[PDB]
């Protein structure tokens, strides 16, 4: 039992304290006034961590760490209830997207991440309908697109305007994809619907790699 | 209530007559204590004797009678309860004989026949394990009844009027309930032919022959009974524990460390076969599935061609699972799509003479066609040519029918 054993274990748990506290407080650098309070529980442990003795560190620091966690629990509940209220009180779905793009890294903490599936699905049907509109409008072709005629008046070759059309549609789809993953978290295709929308956006993208047009033309 | 006070009066007068341990008056104290205590407690034995009548007066089987027999643990020091016990020794021994012969009937309907076979197999127990477990449970229940009779008289039940026959029934039933024969047959068969069945991991793929109409051939991986043998060894070890053949245990270990791969492969093969059944039961679908079917068979060829790739195994397994997974979703997806198409196609003679509705139908059908375009199937426009030709015929037919009818209207 080489003496440094519990020192090693202690160091890794204190690692996790600096790691996880540092993370959560570093995410609140994307902001109701519990920020300093998280830093208070953090420093509660930095003071009552008693400059990490070994014996009493076990027998007392267990409750010290736990105490800090309890303060994060309250911090969570307040942030989740707060954000669900700013989400529910958000009147626009785009506004709702802005709140999701306002807490990207906060939709990581499973504690937070659990209660949003309803709003998620509302946003998914929004994304759904708009990519469906892209299937529609892109299913109409560039020669018959009136955009070709307006672009032509703006004096471009039809070749260019056609690929501009294509490439821009691609950019809207890609923007939708980043909307999707920011909403659904980075584990996104693993999620029930993300796999589907991934496949669909990919095949839709494969029907947009226009280098052949430039080749033959 | 009535007896507690009685017993306590006897005790307190006896606690005073003991003279606080007068050994020199042990005759006086103890004998006098018995002079009063004996008679008063036997007067309590009268009410206990009413419950002695209740011993039979309560039950109908030796089980519940035995429960109340165990209830009176104080009375086994008094050979007065033994009288009614000797009276019900007959009934107790015969009822226990009833139960033991019932066990005989149960064992005679051995494990492959009894419902224990189905239930034990449902909970994934080998036939060896289920048989020997069931046998040892009956062994325990047999000795449990023997323990009941051991409590009945202690030792007189052995050379009893009928306990001499109970002993015989038990001895023959012990010889019936033997599992060393099964353990030996297990170690036997496994060491007679499963000596080579163990490490059959190399030839991963094996073609076949299936004498049926046309005499088809399928694909098969070589892990059918081995997995159950692994479960057999684990069951014997944790269950009873023998001097289990260590060579078989290590060969089982080697089968374990390669077993999940084979599971995945076997399910992929089965799903592949199921999909091929669904695909060739249809005919139009083949045109569009052709590419993916060739893809699946491309990886199937690359999987069969190699046998035992100790280094590259896991990625092939995962590639396989996803290919057949996709493939299956595509067939399901296409099936649903096609039936929506056909409800429109077969409904083209329903909405009589309405161009708007006709247009609507066609639009819906080609919405399904763009769905087909995205996850591109194989030869989609060719199949569309076919469609369009029959659509033209249903159209022109509905047309000419309405044409004639409108000629009579226009008369």
Could you name the key traits of this structure?
homodimer, 217 residues, mainly alpha, elongated, motor protein
Structure explained in plain terms:
The structure is a homodimer. Helix content of chain A is 74%, strand content 0%. Chain A has 217 residues and is mostly helical. Chain A has one domain. The termini of chain A are far apart. The interface between A and B is small, with 7 and 5 residues.
Would you summarize the structure shown here?
It is classed as motor protein. 2 copies of one chain form a homodimer. Chain A is mainly alpha-helical.
Task: Write the topology of this structure.
Two copies of one chain form a homodimer.
Chain A: H1 5-27, H2 35-48, H3 55-88, H4 93-100, H5 110-113, H6 117-139, H7 146-153, H8 158-184, H9 194-206, H10 211-216
Helix pairs in contact in A: 2-3, 6-8, 7-8, 8-9
């Amino acid at each position: 039992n080489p003496a440094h054993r519990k020192l090693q274990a202690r160091l890794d748990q204190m690692r996790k304290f600096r790691r996880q506290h540092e993370q959560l407080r570093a995410v609140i650098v994307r902001v109701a006034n519990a920020i300093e309070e998280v830093n208070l529980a953090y420093e509660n442990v930095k003071e009552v961590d008693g400059l990490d003795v070994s014996k009493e560190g076990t027998e007392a620091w267990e409750a010290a760490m736990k105490r800090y966690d309890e303060r994060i629990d309250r911090v969570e509940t307040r942030i989740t209830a707060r954000l669900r209220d700013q989400l529910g009180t958000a009147k626009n779905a785009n506004e709702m997207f802005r709140i999701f793009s306002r807490f990207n890294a906060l939709f990581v903490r499973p504690h937070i991440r659990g209660a949003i599936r309803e709003y998620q699905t509302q946003l998914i049907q929004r994304v759904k309908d708009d990519i469906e509109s892209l299937h529609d409008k892109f299913k109409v072709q560039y020669p018959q697109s009136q955009a070709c005629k307006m672009s032509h008046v703006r004096d471009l070759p039809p070749v260019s305007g056609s690929i501009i059309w294509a490439k821009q549609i691609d950019r809207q789809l890609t923007a939708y994809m980043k909307r999707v993953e920011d909403v659904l978290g980075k584990g996104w295709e693993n999620h029930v619907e993300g796999q589907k929308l991934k496949q669909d956006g990919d095949s839709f993208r494969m029907k947009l790699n226009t280098q052949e047009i430039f080749d033959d033309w």
